[PDB]
């Protein structure tokens, strides 16, 4: 109340918890526990009792945080403060906690755990959004709606088809973020400058024991491999290769929400549940998507000036940039989830706009109809052009409705097509392959993509 609190955590509690202090130091302890287990397996002198005391004390409490804070004020080393504090509650382990490791054994491996786990929180939520939009697209596959290019009237599309543009961008995000998560390895045990010198000495020169230790702690946290070559840290390029995809997802969210905000002004599509309504979720979505787009630059700059085996100018920036990116991404997915469940469509508003704009785009159909009934193209083209100009002036210069079809209905020249005119201007015949395109897309791209998330009800 007397200090600034980031609105990004005050938000799913699950993502917020992932990047909480309790989780950070708890994960350090899990790392210390598992290092001990793996070293003990490889023959180092670590008692059973040491393991049991550590296993039971993986979670910090406020009293221990106070011991840690006080130790840290003294020596100004957060990792050693927490080595010490772990040792007060697991006295039997006090001498072997962190054995052989450098600071990054916990700070960096925890961060890789949070990237991986954080991505595992995002991915089912993204799949949920994709699924709800896909249902919406299917439902509205063949509802004609005015096309827009330059945000000006254009060949009709369908409400469904337009939604598949949104879905297609999100499918690439699913692709990109699944890769980013699957590409992640474990730093494991690497030592102060990445040479594993302390662990090699610990195992009395046994290279295979060092390699086995690295593989073991990797396996214990569910990672597919240990990084083969590092300095002190995992490469900060890895942060860029995760937040890059996140920034692209930001652009996707921003476009989708901007589209709905335009459609809401047009009273055609609105957010789920008053005559006047503001697309507030979409506006919030855009606002935070923009943050996700900007924050990526931090990772590029950080990676670009990491000198040699590591410089510490990565640390403070990453404590901000990594949690905020994942919190923001998580808030966006939650917001999109709320938006996509029950989008409100107004077919009669959509239909009205089509009736006001389509006749200016149907003038070639009229010519074709006249010619087929034995008329002259150049004669019809000129007549319909005159009437189009007149109707255009009523709209723009008189602020009236489009009376082009009335003018045709009143002009005896068009007698050979009066009978077919309503069929001739049937919006369903103007949407090209839009409905078929939806069908193929949902079957060939969306459903295979959603298949690994099928357990989601």
Automatic annotation (TrEMBL):
PROSITE patterns the UniProt entry points to: FUMARATE_LYASES
EC number(s) per entry: 4.3.2.2
UniProt entry keywords in alphabetical sequence: Lyase, Purine biosynthesis
Enzyme's top EC category: lyase
Gene Ontology process terms (BP): 'de novo' AMP biosynthetic process; 'de novo' IMP biosynthetic process
Pathway annotation from the record: Purine metabolism; AMP biosynthesis via de novo pathway; AMP from IMP: step 2/2; Purine metabolism; IMP biosynthesis via de novo pathway; 5-amino-1-(5-phospho-D-ribosyl)imidazole-4-carboxamide from 5-amino-1-(5-phospho-D-ribosyl)imidazole-4-carboxylate: step 2/2
Domain Adenylosuccinate lyase C-terminal as annotated: residue spans: 358-442
Matches recorded under SMART domains: ADSL_C (SM00998)
GO molecular function: (S)-2-(5-amino-1-(5-phospho-D-ribosyl)imidazole-4-carboxamido) succinate lyase (fumarate-forming) activity; N6-(1,2-dicarboxyethyl)AMP AMP-lyase (fumarate-forming) activity
Alphabetical list of SUPFAM superfamilies matching this protein: L-aspartase-like
Gene Ontology CC annotation, any one: cytosol
Reactions performed catalytically: (2S)-2-[5-amino-1-(5-phospho-beta-D-ribosyl)imidazole-4-carboxamido]succinate = 5-amino-1-(5-phospho-beta-D-ribosyl)imidazole-4-carboxamide + fumarate; N(6)-(1,2-dicarboxyethyl)-AMP = fumarate + AMP
Family from the record: Belongs to the lyase 1 family. Adenylosuccinate lyase subfamily.
Subunit-structure text: Homotetramer. Residues from neighboring subunits contribute catalytic and substrate-binding residues to each active site.
UniProt-recorded name of the protein: Adenylosuccinate lyase
Organism: Cryptococcus neoformans (strain H99 / ATCC 208821 / CBS 10515 / FGSC 9487) (Cryptococcus neoformans var. grubii serotype A)
């Amino acid at each position: 109340m007397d200090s600034y609190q980031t609105p990004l955590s005050s938000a799913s509690k699950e993502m917020s918890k992932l990047f909480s202090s309790g989780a950070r130091f708890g994960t350090w302890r899990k790392l210390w526990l598992n290092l001990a287990i793996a070293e003990k397996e490889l023959g180092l002198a670590i008692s059973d009792a040491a393991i049991e005391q550590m296993k039971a004390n993986l979670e910090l409490d406020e009293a221990q945080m106070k011991v840690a804070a006080e130790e840290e004020k003294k020596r100004r080393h957060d990792v050693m403060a927490h080595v010490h504090t772990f040792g007060t509650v697991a006295p039997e382990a006090a001498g072997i906690i962190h054995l052989g490791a450098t600071s990054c054994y916990v700070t960096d491996n925890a961060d890789l755990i949070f990237l991986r786990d954080g991505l595992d929180i995002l991915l089912p939520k993204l799949a949920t959004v994709i699924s709800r939009l896909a249902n919406f697209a299917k439902q509205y596959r063949d509802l004609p709606t005015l096309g827009f290019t330059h945000f000006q009237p254009a060949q009709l599309t369908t409400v469904g088809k337009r939604a598949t543009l949104w879905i297609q961008e999100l499918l690439w995000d699913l692709r990109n973020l699944q890769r980013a998560r699957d590409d992640l390895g474990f730093r494991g045990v690497k030592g102060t400058t990445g040479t594993q010198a302390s662990f090699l000495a610990l195992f009395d020169g046994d290279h295979a024991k060092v390699e086995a230790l690295d593989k073991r702690v990797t396996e214990l946290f569910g990672f597919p491999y240990a990084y083969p070559v590092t300095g002190q840290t995992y490469s900060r390029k890895i942060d860029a290769d995760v937040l890059g995809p996140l920034s692209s997802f930001g652009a996707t969210v921003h476009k989708i929400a901007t589209d709905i905000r335009l459609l809401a002004n047009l009273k055609e599509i609105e957010e789920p549940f008053a005559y006047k309504r503001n697309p507030m979720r979409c506006e919030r979505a855009c606002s935070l998507a923009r943050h996700l787009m900007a924050i990526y630059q931090n990772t590029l700059m950080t990676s670009s000036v990491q000198w040699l085996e590591r410089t510490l100018d990565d640390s403070a920036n990453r404590r901000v940039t990594i949690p905020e990116a994942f919190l923001t991404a998580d808030i966006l997915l939650t917001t999109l989830q709320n938006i996509s469940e029950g989008l409100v469509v107004y077919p009669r508003v959509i239909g009205r706009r089509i009736s006001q704009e389509l006749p200016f785009m149907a003038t070639e159909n009229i010519i074709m109809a006249i010619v087929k009934a034995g008329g002259d193209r150049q004669e019809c083209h000129e007549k319909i052009r005159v009437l189009s100009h007149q109707a255009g002036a009523v709209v723009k210069e008189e602020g009236g409705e489009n009376d082009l079809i009335d003018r045709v209905k009143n002009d005896e020249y068009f007698k050979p097509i009066w009978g077919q005119l309503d069929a001739l201007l049937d919006p369903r015949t103007f949407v090209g392959r839009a409905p078929e395109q939806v069908d193929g897309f949902l079957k060939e791209w969306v459903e295979p993509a959603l298949k690994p998330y099928e357990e989601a009800l």
